[PDB]
């Protein structure tokens, strides 16, 4: 999950969570 927004991990891309604009790292 996006610990930012939670959402699923099946939604980054690019390098961000295409949700929120997390950076990667942000993803547990
Ligand atoms: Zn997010």
Same mark, same amino acid.
């Given at each position: 999950? *996006?610990?930012?927004? %939670?959402?699923?991990?099946?939604?980054?891309? %690019? %390098?961000? *969570?295409?949700? *929120? %604009?997390?950076?990667?790292?942000?993803?547990?």
């Amino acid at each position: 999950y *996006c610990s930012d927004c %939670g959402a699923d991990a099946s939604q980054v891309r %690019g %390098g961000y *969570c295409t949700n *929120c %604009g997390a950076s990667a790292d942000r993803i547990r």
